[PDB]
Inverse folding.
DNA sequence: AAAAAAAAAAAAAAAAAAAAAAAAA
DNA sequence: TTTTTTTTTTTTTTTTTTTTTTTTT
């Protein structure tokens, strides 16, 4: 189910620009072998597969470098076009295609994606809808039957991103987050934290304004009380004048009237003309914002605990697969087994400037659980990442047989290579009994190819080598011509 | 035995160099090949019929090739004459080589007991010139490689004809081919077995094939039904289980022999049966096979334990079940070792280190123990210190977050936000795509509290405003 | 002529705690092949060499994971030591022994660098004087003749921290300012930037301080003017009417007097006592700091330009070597050569939040200078990084000929591997005259070792493998069992 | 002249089978030269073929190269022609390390016409636990007598191979390609001995075959002339692909040294540009006469060394278009060398069409090398090495001065505002040299407070323009 | 075809931690 | 010899800018 059939790479990386240089690669079952010299566009095929399936460029690069460079091609712009023909989960043939352009705008290279086409054959008619990127991605996900994160990380993992299971806690958590299809809830966590942080900044601002206003309130109340006192003295002077009936007291009353009118003018100053309500309302706003901030802290902590509990629950099932695979395919006597352990932060809060993520894979040497990341071997790391990817494919992707290993035996020794080949043979034999399974393997070693081809024999492989014009050529060769490329 | 008996020492899947780099498992396949050659020499067989897979590696190392060549020079070469002749044209059967004649037909080599062989799936022609290890042996003048397929479209199996007295053999060879390809040729009738025209029905048709026999894949196996009816026996080769006894086919009435590998290449529960090599005796059109045990191959003992199938000492919960399963497996391994020791009596050539395997199926929820601390017990007592024990087995975020929010609202005290109010905002955010649900709810509650506090004319006191908002939250949530 | 000689590892990574598993490795010349299974101690030996030479732990790991784990060792504390015996540039025997203690407490392990030893012969002195970390590092740097950066990056490069030439702009810039010994000037650059940013945040605070001081000054000047006018009115009325209205005059006098005294007491409040002086002083400070900020920005820009010019001045020669090495080693006619290009940002300011660095390795594909990072294959990246390291070794490492290549033939095809073997053989042949070259190839490829053994023959190689209790014993094997370990 | 007392030995060395076997142009190139060597041996009716090692380029030869070597050896080395010389020495010592110590033609099951006595080179040196080489495979197959292999690393004792034809006695000493460091140690330590014949040590030609380095810049890693056995009469010396096959005596050594050279251009060094030849040694009692024979099947090699410093008339340094001139000169050189190859080709008809052409350029006075990827795309189909056509090879900057220059230039270009001229340059110099965490914020502090202080004491009105005007006036009084 | 607003990432920046240096005791 | 205090480095989470995408105009 969900088997890829054909590809047409044009204008991507070292592949040529004109139609004459558009290369076609047909994927075999159950094992497709890609060989060739360094460069030459072997990984570029996996990059095109990932881009047409999901729309994501290889890690560390954007569309500016993915497309053939217009400066190298000596053209003002370069138009690339990848077309993939595959069968969906039900079995219908689909011929999705994606187009991009990389124009040369002065020194920089401007990139733009054209509208792709979906071609679903129906009753002998090949429709062609010029859908946009969002519809293209939705249709690819619904046809291949697997999520975008799975296609990105488990199936079409880039060569430079192949060791993603042994990244830092944040990156590993995000990867297993999008894989577990729970990224909307962490987006909710993110907006919760951002709202608390903005509210905390607003609370801080309100408190300096509060300093300035309390002073205004005190000044207004002091001058109001003094105005009342002067009015009382004016009334007393008037009473004394009445008692006499005193011109000195009349002048005193006149001066008191002048004081009263001048201070009533002072009260009318917009600085504290209505400070009584303004200060009260702004203090109320500060207090209510800080109370909501406390509630946001509590809810952020609760949601974080819920999300990690969900992560641990989802990982509990695939941990058994990881353990079994590590026990079966690790020839060394170092690590009994490995698993992924996620630990929530008990002291987490939305006011934290920097968070602490405890997502990790652990090497259990003996009975003590060590941290595999950092202290693991290079070959151990390669094998661990490969085992994690294989278990992830076994668990989630049952409607997408494809798995695509870009040089799986990178740092593995002789016996680990043999065990990995044996494991891949077992995976092919188990998964190809009922549904189609494809195991695209770009490689540069010919003892791995022999071990893989002993069972489920391959008959035709692909030689991907450059030509005179320095484009990339995808040619098909029989097994008899296999040793000329691999080492 | 007489002048017409065609004694053929049939052997198959003698892998060479299997675990050659292994200190304890090395120099074992060479010993088995030495024993096979000794059996052939002592029994004075006419020739040796190898079923393929004579070399484990596709490109055999220097040590394995050198040892094989030394053994062939020691045994296969001799002054004894050959008592049978070849009636087929050797320019076709062995026409791939630049010397297209049988090794004893060459005047530069004095071959006593020739070795006819086919190529298995481990050593098949690969390369620009399509060379195999058996081709190296044939070029050296030791092994007659026959039955190679010379086409990728149609397989015409031209036989090599042998005559000893009145007994005639039409030896057919078919090297191992990608199983799906051979199946697709069999179903499409693209394979034809050429037969000798003279004396058509007096040839003892023998077929040697290196293909999967059991249920491996939909196209990754060759059923016996597709083989031609005119064959009399069919040695089979790719299957390492020892089935030297010829079996009757009720559908086509041709015998089938499965010599099986000499060495235990895989730890499947099919190699536990003792390995024997055949001794074919052919008189006219009558076949008699006498098996000879191999005393130079270490015994392979394996048992299957299903913990879920033993609900008597393995309770699923059982907080101390790890020790129980470890002890049970310990007794199993010890019993296997004792059986190996007790069978080793009377055999001075079988290496003193049995191959022990123990597959465990914890389908019932049990957890595996340390294979890495349960093998240290048998580091020096088994020939496979690593593969002693094999372990194998045969919720929505919305509900979890809802239950967590439900526990939180009832476990802690909310200052201002209403009971059960964020949780329905987060669900709106993640389900209705509204990217400002949290902000809108927070601002709404903020504005409502501010308006109520303004309306009631609270003083600018922290305790008073806290009490007021607490009472507002505790009274307005009812309706 | 620094020549490493022998070195002992105890308690580091997986090497045993007791002083019985103290593995000793004697480095041969000019080729020292290290082989073994995945795990073992192959890269740990290079890690120990780098730690002895410089004191820097492997990347991604602090001292907590470098030492043998106390939990795995089943001990409360683990004592590790590495003793390297070598010769310095003057050909005198030196032996340095560093120590460390993990001393795990509670759940979180700790670390502590014990005092080292500088055991060195002086007429048979063998003085084992104890030295601090700084003294150890300075002595090792002085004796080996190569700086800490060269030892960390060119000579002893960790497997994980390889392809560092193909890193981001800032990372590459700060690896060639430590190789070019310009770290002090860039620390001064960062000091200038920090000072400028601090003065800018003082100026931003002074904005609102000046606003409020201006408001206070306007209030104070208004009340002073109203004081002077009231006093003038009081005295004018006094001397006009003092020369019935007579007592009305006196009442007006007392009113004016109370107005004057209250106004004067309002003046003596701190916010208005002298606001002109405070406003002037704050304006003076603000303007002075703004002008100093302008000068600091100018000086930061010119010092950044000077640093970039010095980097280019060294990089032109290093690239002159790199071009030849790449054109002699790379077996592919698609990249004409490579070089490292850097240029200062045109609009660079000390107030910028993010400063973009443009230090990169550029592939010259055809006639255009593309950037290697982001659009190079794994094999081209590996070869370019190895060639850049080799070029830096010829330029900077002329008094130290150690160069540890940890699995150089990774993601390299057959032709490039043969060419790399030829280049390494030529390097050994050319750099072994009047000096002592020492290569530390640690590979898992039989073919690469067999190509390296035809010239500059290997008589003995070191095989690192685990023992019964997983201790990574180092065993010395003559060349009669090499194939037992290589793939 | 040949008679019953004339040893006709064909001397070949460094055949290097399997060199670039996967290259389309030069794949089968080596098995054509080997075929020509064997054909020369057969048509000259030589007694035996003596090889100086390096018969196989790869240590573990692939299936194709080994198979082709076996094919050629079986075709030519094997025949019904009887051998004419006998080995009057115990074959269990010189032909040791094998389970069949007897010579290949002394086997009763082998019909060898022209035996081959070969030593092992450094490319195919014995590796493995059993210490086997490809020569051991060839010996076990019964084609080549591998002799002269070292026994132990403690000391080497070269056991002779005593063979004679009538009145001509020749002792065939042989030494494998031991690492050249061990051989220097083992010579200065005198831990080496050549066992002389047990009797009549006067009538022995004492032909010694060695495969080691020779006079070169690697003084530590080579065996110098003399410094060897003094009673030798011919030391064939391989591992030197330059052909010096003419036996030339030195000033005082009393033994001829022959350097047959390789039969294929493995490296592109100028030494291999010379024509390759074959030995055809003839020995009559004690007389030596070696007649070189050209190898027509060897691909032509043309190397020219040019340096750009010694051609100043055309290659002018500091020229706008010197690169175009260099490219034109290199193109003319390539064209002239290709035309020379074409002219030399028509003298025969066996040389491969595409010659090996390469020149090295030594730009040292300052030159930009041209794009070697565009010079050599004009030659995809006219040179056997399309990539290695052009080789390019060759043969203060204080930070303080640069930063001081930039500081003074910036100060002269743009005027400052408050900071004193030249102060912060010395401030940062003190920061760097004296490594103290000051002098930057302190220079700023000092200067800010001096200026602020003055601006107040002078009673300056708080406005915008006047304050900066007076701070500028105060700044100008520094000079 | 154009504007401007926003989503995404990658590469520079900053928090936090943990060990070393110091600087008091 | 111990303890506390501040300093400096590093790992890794965070923020910033820029470029492409999407929506309107
Ligand atoms: N934007 C681009 N324009 C032109 N060539 C490119 C571009 N990006 C990469 N390349 C080149 O295209 C090739 C792609 O290599 P890749 O397919 O990753 O190699 P491999 O197949 O060995 O893994 C390399 O030669 C690379 O330098
Ligand atoms: N802190 C540690 N404690 C114990 N074992 C460790 C520790 N760190 C690493 N190891 C193990 O020690 C070995 C070190 O690996 P390394 O020497 O880097 O491998 P390689 O030589 O294969 O490159 C691995 O087996 C690793 O799992
Ligand atoms: F994992 Be090891 F370094 F090959
Ligand atoms: F480096 Be490439 F992917 F072979
Ligand atoms: Mg790749
Ligand atoms: Mg490593
Ligand atoms: Mn078999
Ligand atoms: Mn040689």
């Amino acid at each position: 189910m969900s088997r890829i059939e054909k590809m047409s790479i044009l204008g991507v990386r070292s592949f040529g620009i004109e139609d004459k240089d558009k290369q076609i690669i047909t994927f075999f079952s159950p094992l497709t072998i890609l060989v060739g010299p360094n460069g030459a566009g072997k990984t570029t095929i996996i990059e095109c597969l990932k881009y047409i399936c999901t729309g994501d460029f290889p890690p560390g690069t954007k569309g500016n470098t993915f497309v053939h460079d217009p400066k190298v091609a000596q053209e003002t712009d370069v138009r690339a076009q990848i077309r993939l023909q595959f069968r969906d989960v039900n079995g219908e043939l689909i011929a999705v295609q994606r187009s991009m352009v990389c124009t040369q705008k002065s020194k920089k290279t401007e990139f733009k994606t054209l509208e792709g086409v979906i071609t679903r054959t129906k009753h002998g008619e090949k429709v062609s809808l010029s859908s946009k990127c969002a519809e293209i991605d939705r249709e690819m996900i619904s046809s291949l039957g697997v999520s975008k994160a799975v296609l990105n990380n488990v199936i079409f993992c880039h060569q430079e991103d192949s060791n993603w299971p042994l990244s830092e806690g944040k990156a590993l958590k995000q990867k297993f987050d999008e894989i577990f299809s729970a990224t909307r809830y962490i987006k909710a966590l993110e907006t919760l934290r951002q709202v608390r942080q903005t509210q905390g900044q607003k609370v801080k601002e309100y408190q300096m304004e509060l300093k300035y206003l309390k002073q205004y309130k005190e000044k207004a109340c002091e001058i109001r009380d003094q105005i009342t006192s002067k009015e009382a003295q004016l009334t007393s002077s008037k009473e004394i004048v009445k008692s006499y009936e005193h011109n000195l007291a009349l002048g005193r009353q006149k001066g008191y009237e002048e004081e009263i009118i001048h201070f009533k003018k002072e009260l009318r100053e917009p600085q504290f003309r209505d400070a009584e309500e303004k200060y009260r309302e702004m203090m109320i706003v500060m207090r209510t914002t800080e109370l909501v901030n406390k509630d946001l802290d509590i809810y952020y902590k609760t949601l974080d605990q819920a999300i990690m509990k969900f992560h641990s629950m989802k990982m509990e099932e695939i941990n058994k697969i990881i353990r079994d695979l590590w026990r079966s395919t690790y020839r060394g006597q170092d690590i009994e087994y490995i698993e992924i352990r996620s630990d929530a932060d008990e002291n987490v809060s939305a006011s934290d400037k920097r968070r602490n993520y405890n997502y990790r894979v652990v090497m259990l040497k003996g009975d003590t659980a060590l941290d595999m990341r950092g202290r693991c071997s290079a070959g151990q790391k390669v094998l661990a990442s490969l085992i994690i990817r294989l278990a992830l494919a076994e668990t989630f992707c049952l409607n997408c047989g494809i798995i695509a290993l870009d040089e799986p035996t990178t740092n593995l020794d002789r016996e680990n290579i043999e065990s990995l080949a044996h494991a891949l043979v077992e995976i092919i034999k188990s998964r190809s009994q009922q549904r189609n399974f494809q195991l695209l393997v770009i490689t540069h070693d010919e003892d791995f190819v022999e071990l893989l081809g002993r069972s489920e024999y391959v008959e035709k492989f692909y030689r991907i080598k450059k030509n005179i014009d320095q484009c990339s050529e995808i040619v098909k060769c029989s097994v008899s011509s296999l040793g000329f490329n691999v080492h | 035995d007489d002048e017409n008996t065609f004694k053929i020492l049939v052997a198959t899947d003698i892998h060479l160099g299997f675990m050659e780099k292994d200190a304890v498992r090395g120099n074992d396949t060479f010993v088995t090949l030495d024993e096979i050659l000794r059996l052939a020499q002592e029994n004075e067989v006419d020739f040796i019929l190898l079923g393929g897979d004579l070399f484990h590696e596709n490109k055999p190392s220097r040590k394995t090739l050198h040892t094989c060549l030394e053994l062939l020079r020691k045994y296969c070469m001799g002054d004894r004459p050959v008592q049978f002749e070849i009636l087929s044209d050797q320019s076709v059967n062995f026409g791939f080589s630049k010397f297209p004649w049988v090794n004893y037909q060459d005047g530069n080599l004095n071959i006593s007991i020739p070795v006819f062989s086919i190529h298995g799936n481990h050593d098949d022609p690969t390369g620009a010139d399509a060379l195999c290890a058996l081709d190296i042996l044939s070029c050296a003048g030791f092994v007659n490689h026959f039955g190679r397929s010379m086409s990728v479209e149609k397989i015409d199996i031209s036989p090599v004809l042998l005559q000893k007295g009145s007994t005639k053999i039409a030896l057919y060879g078919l090297g191992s081919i990608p199983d799906e390809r051979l199946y697709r040729m069999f179903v499409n009738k693209k394979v034809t077995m050429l037969r000798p025209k003279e004396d058509e029905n007096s040839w003892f048709n023998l077929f040697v094939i290196h293909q999967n026999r059991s249920k491996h894949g939909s196209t990754n196996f060759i059923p016996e039904q597709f083989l031609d009816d005119f064959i009399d026996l069919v040695i089979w080769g790719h299957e390492h289980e020892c089935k030297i006894a010829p079996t009757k086919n009720e559908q086509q009435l041709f015998y089938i022999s499965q010599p099986g590998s000499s060495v235990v290449t895989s730890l499947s529960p099919g190699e536990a049966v003792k390995k024997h090599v055949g001794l074919l005796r052919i008189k006219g059109r009558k076949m008699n096979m006498h098996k000879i045990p191999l005393h130079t191959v270490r015994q392979f003992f394996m048992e299957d334990i299903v913990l879920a199938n033993h609900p008597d000492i393995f309770n699923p919960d059982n907080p101390k079940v790890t020790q129980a399963i470890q002890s049970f497996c310990l007794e199993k391994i010890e019993e296997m070792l004792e059986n190996a020791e007790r069978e080793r009596l009377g055999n001075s050539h079988q290496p003193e280190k049995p191959l022990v395997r123990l597959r465990v199926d914890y389908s019932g929820g049990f957890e595996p123990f340390s294979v890495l601390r349960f093998s240290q017990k048998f580091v020096d007592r088994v020939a496979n210190p690593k593969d002693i024990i094999h372990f194998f087995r045969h919720l929505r975020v919305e509900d979890l977050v809802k239950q967590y929010f439900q526990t939180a609202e009832k476990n802690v005290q909310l200052s201002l936000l209403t009971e059960r109010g964020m949780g329905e905002a987060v669900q709106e955010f993640v389900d209705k795509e509204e990217k400002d649900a949290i902000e809108e709810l927070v601002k709404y509650q903020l504005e409502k509290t501010q308006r109520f506090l303004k309306e009631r004319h609270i003083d600018a006191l922290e305790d008073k405003i806290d009490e007021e908002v607490r009472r507002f939250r505790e009274t307005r949530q009812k309706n």
About this structure: Residues 59-60, 62, 353-354, 356 of chain A lie near DNA strand E (CB under 10 Å from a C1'). The radius of gyration of chain A is 36 Å.
